[PDB]
Amino acid sequence: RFQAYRKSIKNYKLSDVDYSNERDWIVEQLKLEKRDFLQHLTQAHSSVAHLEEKFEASVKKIVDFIAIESFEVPFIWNHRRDYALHTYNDDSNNTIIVKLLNEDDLWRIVQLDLDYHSIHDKKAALSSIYKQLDLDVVDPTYEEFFGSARTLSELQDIDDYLTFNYSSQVKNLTS
Amino acid sequence: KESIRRDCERVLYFQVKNSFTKKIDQAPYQPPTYAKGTIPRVLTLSFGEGNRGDAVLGVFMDDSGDVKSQIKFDEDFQSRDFSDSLTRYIKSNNINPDIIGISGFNIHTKKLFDKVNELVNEERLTIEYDSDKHLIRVIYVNDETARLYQHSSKSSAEYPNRPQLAKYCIGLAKYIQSPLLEYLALDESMYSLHI
Amino acid sequence: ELTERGKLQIEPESPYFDFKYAKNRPISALTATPDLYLRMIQAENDGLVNIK
Amino acid sequence: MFFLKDLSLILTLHPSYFGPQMNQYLREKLLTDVEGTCTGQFGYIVTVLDGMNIDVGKGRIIPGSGSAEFEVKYRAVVWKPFKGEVVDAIVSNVSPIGFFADVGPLNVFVSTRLIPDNLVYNPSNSPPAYMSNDELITKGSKVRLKVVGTRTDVNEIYAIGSIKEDFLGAI
Amino acid sequence: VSTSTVGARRRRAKQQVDDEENATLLRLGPEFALKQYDHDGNEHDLIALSLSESRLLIREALKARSRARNGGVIDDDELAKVTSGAVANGVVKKTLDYLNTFARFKDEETCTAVDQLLHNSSDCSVLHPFEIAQLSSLGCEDVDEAITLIPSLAAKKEVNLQRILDELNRLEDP
Amino acid sequence: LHSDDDTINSETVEIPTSDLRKIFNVGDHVRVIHGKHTDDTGLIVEVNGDKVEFISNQTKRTVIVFSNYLIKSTDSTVSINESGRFELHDLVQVNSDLVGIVIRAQKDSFDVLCSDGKLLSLPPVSIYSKLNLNPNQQIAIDSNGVEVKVGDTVREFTGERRQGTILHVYRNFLFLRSREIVENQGVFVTSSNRVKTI
Amino acid sequence: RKAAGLIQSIQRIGSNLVNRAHLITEQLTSKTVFLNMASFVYIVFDPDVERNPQGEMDLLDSTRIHPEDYSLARKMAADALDIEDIDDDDESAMRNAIYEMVFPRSPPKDEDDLTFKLDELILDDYATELERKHQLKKRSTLQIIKEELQSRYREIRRDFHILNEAEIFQLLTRETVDSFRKGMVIPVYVRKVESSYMSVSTQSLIAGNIQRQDILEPNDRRDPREVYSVGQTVRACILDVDYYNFKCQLSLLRQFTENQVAGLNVNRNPKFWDIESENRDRQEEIDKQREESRESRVIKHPFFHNMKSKEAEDYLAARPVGDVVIRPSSKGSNHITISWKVAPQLYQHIDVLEENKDDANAI
Amino acid sequence: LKHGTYEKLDEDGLIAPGVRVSGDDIIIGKTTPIPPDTEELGQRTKYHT
RNA sequence: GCUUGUGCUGUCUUCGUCCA
């Protein structure tokens, strides 16, 4: 099933910096999608500090399992459930287990892992185009909205900006 | 517009996945005084469309998955003869059902269900483990997979000398014995179900 | 808004009648009812309505 | 390609319409039965020139049924694609098996096996597209394709195009 | 449904290679042959039409019909809605959109000049009307491009193709 | 034979069939002689020597069949009789709560028009059952209150004001057959409340 | 594809898989694929067949415990049986201990096996020591091992679903309880007509019933038999549904059958629905339903001429006084206007009302 | 079966003397056996042989 | 609760009927 999912991916093995960016992107995507669950977690478990940091660490560990160790969702759900939940002892010494992630969230993490590679390819192509442009001085707007870019729509916008303002270099390389 | 479309498609995808998970998450029927997950012995009955001409066909499946003693009743199901034949059939020493399943094509199946239930209650037909004694259960069976099974060429090859209604009864009994495998046997046809 | 095809063919029987004259529906609430927005898009693809 | 052709139609009229407005009623019936139709022999009939001054002649009474049969001759503008012809198009839909374009009323389907390999289909793109390094073809984008095969139906025409040759693709 | 003015064509035994439709070989079949006959049986030539000529003709005929139906009292949508038949309305709408988005000549005088240039020219006196329609429609820019798109023009090398294309581009409104 | 010399092209040569191989050009209607894809027609797309690839007409997908199994047939004219379990224009139960009418029939697939108008393409096995409704059940009532049976011509008053002859009846929906709606071979679905009898 | 290859490989080796480890030692599967699939495929263990704890087969191969946790499960089993000569590195003693825990040779009174001693274990301290020594989070794994040891491969699925009244009704009729409820209007086939009750059958064979107060209108006094006949089909409105007995009650009154049109709870909130555009469109649809067909009238009479009023006056201008012309009237086909020349450039139009007309064009 | 009546026949399939007969009425009742169809799918007393 | 079923041989030979 992983081979079927990754059959369309041109290159799956990311570098270390790109892999860390992938983990951060998946954490941000899950934070966006699971906003109500995180709000419920923060409100109903106010006594425990920094639960969202534990959520981030758990999501990063699940991404690590799926990408590097290539564990499928049932194996993670059954034999790696301790990384998907957090436990603490209250003032009354009450053992409380909090379930940070479920099986559907693991499938969503798989989907985001698959999705991010298109963003990575688009970003690599855009950076390559910028390299062939070979500006004498780095454009502050380009780097400013390239570092924070996280969707292919903004990459398309940067591509449009580059092909407009530096159309002469594009014509020279080549309306 | 594209972003909202993608988000709504994701939400609908997860809703459909949860609905299908609710559909296929069923254990086999647990006979009383037996541990959960034990395969029961099943007897299934159906006359088909419920018309005047249609006769009742029965199929008995044991806990090992082998079809035994398919029979055909040659009398009106609203008569005393059908009740006597069913009482003799169930009380036979070679057949020991744990549950009786009934399904059909229209509202005439309610008359068959009521007749069989009344016969079981009145005659006190209890489960024969051959102490505490329990009556055999009569239920309605969801025939989502049986109607596709009866037309499948695999079923026809498996039972060349049997009619379609016998295959429908076998499908109902197999569904009672293992819903998951019956859903799996549909192959490409399980995407056309009402999920 | 309705095109002429939508102006005619949008009958009470049709599933698209629910949102025939909808307005002031926020984007934040669309994800709660995905079927509604998917039906709107499918109606748009038929050339009956336009989502603005 | 558009052409001018001299066409004829046989119109049968019921005796209940044998009135002074017979000619005009026959004209409107001819217009409703000709405008927009698609015949495989001719292609697509788009409009009829001089639509309000068409001669209808004298109708012949069919023996045994009473109804009159009219022979109406008219000149109309007709469009029909030809095998091995290059025409412009507008992409209407994008799919993994290929893209569907529209050439007027005709819908032309081009499979991936007739598309150059560098125009890789990108389903993640918004909207989905067949894109290359220097080319990007999506919904609503102008495309120039060459018609390779034409499939004739009862009252429909299906065309197949290709963009694998030179001076084709995005324009 | 509609029947052409050409009839007969009964059974025979010989089979010919000039029977399949092919734009490249200029084999347009019997119903689209170079020689046609009118309702009076007189000689008639095949009438090709470029997108400019076709657009002018359809606009003129549609506005004449709309004026006639309204008792003799410009928008494409209303003009399309003048016609009867929902499928007919869709077909005429699609043709109007296609013609509008690829109209090389939206002016009557420019189209008249283009037709006069492509007809009265000595080199074009041998050119097939389909070739004329293709040249006036596709809007080619180069002789090599025109030859690749239109294989029939390769065998007619006695045509001043480049200057005719440049005149067409000049007449084309930028 | 065909060659660059005109004098050779006017000669007929009798050649044994054991030394002849068919020539398949791109963009020709060909009908499959024998195999799993028997009686499938379409247009040739790729000619990889012995193996020929063509876009089908019925399934409308590319199919790879050997050149020995192809005959140049310009028209399909496929008859779907003695196949499946469904005659044309049958009212078929798709699943538990879905129904439709067969619009076009194929060797191993069907086209079904739902009561709401959506079109589906399904294999014959995936169809739940065929509804053999009784004649008394196959009766509906128009907006005026006049009974309308199968074969009665009716014409709408709401909407586009179309007209057709009744082909099937399901609940309040009437399946009508019409001459001018060529989009779905005349079959369009309307509720009985929208029509008036003629 | 991997499943078929695995099945073919097993059928090559002998169609029997003795141990989970044979998926690696016999090269049947690769490392990561086996690591995924090891704990989800199981081999049924029969103690009567395997009398040897040191044998090739394994007890834990019939459980959900992964092979990487087999030594963990055997250490749990050994420590639960209060053994003290046990050392972690001695796998043989671990296997003996787990074998005697799961399959004891002398079980106590009313106990099948020694698995009940696992409940005395403090798994929390064991998980803490595992996390300290080996940096493994195994707190849930100890619980899973305990549950699997107490009952090898339980049935984790939910119980068999038993249909309720709505599900039985939907099964037998294919009409949901949403599309068949109070207030809906359906066509029903009448079957019995009596003085006080009427029995009908719906399309889905649900037997209906209508009472005397719901058959006839309040202003009506005729007998029900005279009004309806057997075999006729009529429209009726549902007043009650009995989802268990498949019986329903209906009413044929005008107030129920026709007025109830808006059967859907469309949210027509003014801030969320375009009320005015809907009203304008509906008014235009009524103004289009008011459209009618009309045509001229033809009359055969020597003094009749199809002319207007002014046309008739001009026609009578060329004629002397007393001549009469007849023209159609503007008030309708049932009226005829007769114009006669009173004087030069003076004419009188008289309207004539027609009664007992055989046809519109007739006199 | 035929369109005529069969109520004038006796148990042995023959009409009795003294009975009124009209056109098409059945006076001799005879049947021939036929290999039964797939009606053994279940037709309790109404499968044609 | 109970409902009504939907058609016919062929080929010769002989004897007859009304004209012619």
Side-chain angles (χ1 to χ4, degrees), chain A residues 97-109:
Chain A
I97 295 93
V98 185
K99 306 177 188 292
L100 304 172
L101 294 161
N102 53 40
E103 209 156 21
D104 288 344
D105 291 322
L106 270 45
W107 287 112
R108 185 59 188 154
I109 287 166

Side-chain angles (χ1 to χ4, degrees), chain C residues 8-9 11 13 15-16 42, chain F residues 118 158-160 190-191 194:
Chain C
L8 296 180
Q9 299 185 246
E11 297 283 77
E13 63 180 3
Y16 308 146
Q42 198 208 342
Chain F
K118 278 74 176 176
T158 70
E160 301 202 317
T190 51
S191 61
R194 289 170 53 165

Side-chain angles (χ1 to χ4, degrees), chain D residues 72-126:
Chain D
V72 191
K73 292 179 215 158
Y74 64 101
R75 308 173 42 81
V77 184
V78 58
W79 188 86
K80 182 169 92 171
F82 307 132
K83 167 153 57 182
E85 189 40 62
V86 185
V87 290
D88 293 331
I90 289 172
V91 170
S92 56
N93 185 23
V94 189
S95 64
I97 60 165
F99 69 101
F100 302 87
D102 297 336
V103 187
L106 168 62
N107 180 255
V108 187
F109 162 60
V110 183
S111 168
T112 51
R113 309 176 179 200
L114 300 180
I115 301 171
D117 302 330
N118 46 321
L119 280 166
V120 184
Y121 167 55
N122 190 0
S124 296
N125 200 335
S126 289

Side-chain angles (χ1 to χ4, degrees), chain B residues 23-31 36-46 59-65 97-104 113 136-146 149 167-183, chain G residues 155 157-163 171:
Chain B
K23 291 175 83 81
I24 54 167
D25 188 7
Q26 290 181 74
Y29 171 81
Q30 178 190 352
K36 188 171 167 177
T38 305
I39 304 299
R41 298 161 294 176
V42 191
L43 172 60
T44 56
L45 297 169
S46 194
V59 167
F60 179 71
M61 284 192 92
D62 69 323
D63 52 6
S64 82
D98 285 306
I99 186 170
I100 292 161
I102 295 174
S103 190
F113 177 85
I136 304 169
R137 279 295 305 280
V138 187
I139 58 158
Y140 288 97
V141 191
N142 178 34
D143 61 342
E144 274 189 316
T145 72
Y149 178 82
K167 303 170 188 173
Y168 178 70
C169 294
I170 292 164
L172 292 174
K174 278 194 175 193
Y175 184 89
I176 288 169
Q177 287 196 330
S178 182
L180 167 66
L181 285 176
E182 269 296 295
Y183 275 107
Chain G
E155 182 60 68
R157 283 179 285 184
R158 272 201 275 285
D159 303 355
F160 192 77
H161 182 46
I162 289 177
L163 282 63
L171 175 74

Side-chain angles (χ1 to χ4, degrees), chain B residues 103-118:
Chain B
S103 190
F105 300 158
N106 53 49
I107 69 163
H108 291 293
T109 316
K110 171 167 166 48
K111 298 188 176 186
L112 177 57
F113 177 85
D114 290 5
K115 188 68 172 176
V116 173
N117 205 32
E118 171 205 340

Side-chain angles (χ1 to χ4, degrees), chain F residues 40-105:
Chain F
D40 194 359
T41 74
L43 288 177
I44 296 169
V45 177
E46 210 171 325
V47 182
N48 288 121
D50 184 77
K51 304 156 190 168
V52 177
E53 314 176 355
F54 76 103
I55 284 168
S56 173
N57 282 359
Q58 283 177 13
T59 62
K60 317 190 177 184
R61 299 147 197 166
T62 72
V63 186
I64 307 168
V65 179
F66 299 101
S67 52
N68 313 337
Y69 296 158
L70 300 179
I71 273 169
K72 179 196 170 184
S73 164
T74 59
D75 195 357
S76 303
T77 60
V78 180
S79 287
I80 324 295
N81 206 32
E82 198 53 47
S83 75
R85 317 193 318 280
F86 311 115
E87 188 57 273
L88 176 61
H89 298 156
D90 272 347
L91 188 71
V92 291
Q93 181 89 18
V94 175
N95 62 49
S96 176
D97 60 355
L98 201 65
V99 74
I101 180 161
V102 174
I103 302 303
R104 212 191 165 289

